[PDB]
Amino acid sequence: SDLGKKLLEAARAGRDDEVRILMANGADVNAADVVGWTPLHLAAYWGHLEIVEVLLKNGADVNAYDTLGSTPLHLAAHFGHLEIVEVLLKNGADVNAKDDNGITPLHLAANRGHLEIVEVLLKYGADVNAQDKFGKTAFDISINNGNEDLAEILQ
């Protein structure tokens, strides 16, 4: 869709007023680019909170995944966007979603030491015994990274 492309580039750039007119003009809420990223994906990746909110109100698929299995909750947990992680979980995002590598958002937050996000994820039912394709849990990530603050959160 021509509108869907203008929405993707507007969501990628954080233009909330252009995103609103595109929503009112009937643009596809779930238009995906070549890599499989929806407007919710890029707004979650680039930390545009209200674009994440406006999209979800207009029926955005909170659990859309790209060609490699990554959800908008994955990107938000990876890049320290704490407020976006909460609104995604509140709008029904799968806390235990796995990509093609069996990797969960808890792994991504633990890998980058996003402790505030780790607590919010486990508060919403994140499986802490979740293993990726190599059999590594979030606890193994804390031991390997040497992050002792996280290693006591997970216990």
Partner: protein, 572 residues
Amino acid sequence: APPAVTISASYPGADAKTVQDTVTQVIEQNMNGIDNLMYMSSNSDSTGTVQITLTFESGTDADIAQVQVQNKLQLAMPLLPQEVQQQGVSVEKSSSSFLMVVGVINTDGTMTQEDISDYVAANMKDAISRTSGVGDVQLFGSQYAMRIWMNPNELNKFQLTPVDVITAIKAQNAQVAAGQLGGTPPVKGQQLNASIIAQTRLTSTEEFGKILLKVNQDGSRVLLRDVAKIELGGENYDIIAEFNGQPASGLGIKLATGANALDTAAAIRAELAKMEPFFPSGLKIVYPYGVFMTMVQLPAGATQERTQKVLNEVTHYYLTKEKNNVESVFAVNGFGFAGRGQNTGIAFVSLKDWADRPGEENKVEAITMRATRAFSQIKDAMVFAFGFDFELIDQAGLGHEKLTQARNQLLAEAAKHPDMLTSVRPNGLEDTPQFKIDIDQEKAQALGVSINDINTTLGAAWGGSYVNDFIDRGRVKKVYVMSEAKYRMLPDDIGDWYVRAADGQMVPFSAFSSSRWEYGSPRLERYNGLPSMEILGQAAPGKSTGEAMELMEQLASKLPTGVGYDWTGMSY
């Protein structure tokens, strides 16, 4: 016009950050002790290319600068990767002008641009570089290169990897010194003295195809052609040159300082007139540049093919609706300015004589105004036909991601003052999706797979590898090993590539690697040795330029900590 020096290097198969942190920075750190240097800027892009441009004070000898710059660079050559030294790091005065552009096509349509380019490299470029008063000559393409297009399915069938193919080629495409019989010092009275001749370079696709990779434990032999497709091709395919829709090559010829332009132009056309009897059937010489250009730039992530369809529509528009005026349309897919890549292109238009262009509608201005209005309705592509220079500096090691946020803060603040500033925009490229693959060391070591085997398998197949040289009809040319295109297109093709472990078992890439999508820069800029982002713009109507610059300086004075700025180019 302030003199300038350009250092050009190439890292085949490298991403923008890879070239900056292994090449660009090391060269920038060695640019010390060079006299009369005003400022320095550099690019590092998608295609594994860096161009460091050092501009000097007006009145500086461009020859002395070129020598002073190259001497310091050459002393830093051991610090660059081996793949970069092999490709050659040129330092030429960017004394741009181009005396003339000579194109080479074939009317019979029996030659690819690769075929044509090889002819120009071998038969023309040298004899043109020797004609009276010519300087540097750049060829639109490259000479032939022995292309090995690997197939991972058959490679895995015989328990082979690209490492074996590279090992086999260096062993069986070698020119070995073997000594003499009866050479000095001899047994006194020796009568026989003959040179010993052992392996020589291979000369054909047939001889590369019979390279013995291995022999099974049964009698069967597996050769290089059993796992790959062999062909004479180009060294890189990042540019596709066309002339009126036909495959094309040619030379860009610059004049050597102190020579005369009308002289050398006639001396070149005379040197080309002598070569025509030696041309194969149908080879013609054109002069594709009373002229103008047309820019083509597609969204981030677009392919070379999609740029070609837009360039073909542009070539078609000029040859159809402007057939009364347009004489030639030289379309270059993959080259533009502010950035090269698969999603950019440029078109060079040559028009008939102005004596046969009566009417204002046939003047260049009315031609570009009409062309720009028709190109307005090209879906998902910008196509135009045809101030101040600001540099935002990373002054405290912030990083590319934060320097972009600081850039957007200044760009947004500048749009708040359309009364003084207009068309404030970045000159560089935006971040694009990239395929990050993470090698898991623990799984690789558990399986006995060498890290070097992995990074060579991945790199050589997906990016290409310059192994060694060979002799093509008596001339030294390159040998490149790469995957056939079918098996290096999409992420699922990664799982098809197998590496061999120490115990002998073939391990697929999927077993020891993970992959994600992320965003990164396809073109990192640097100014005076520090990460930079160039910003262009102009004053609003009725405002002096210095009025606009001070507002930019005011807006830049509130950017996050560690973010500075400088004026360059025409604003220096």
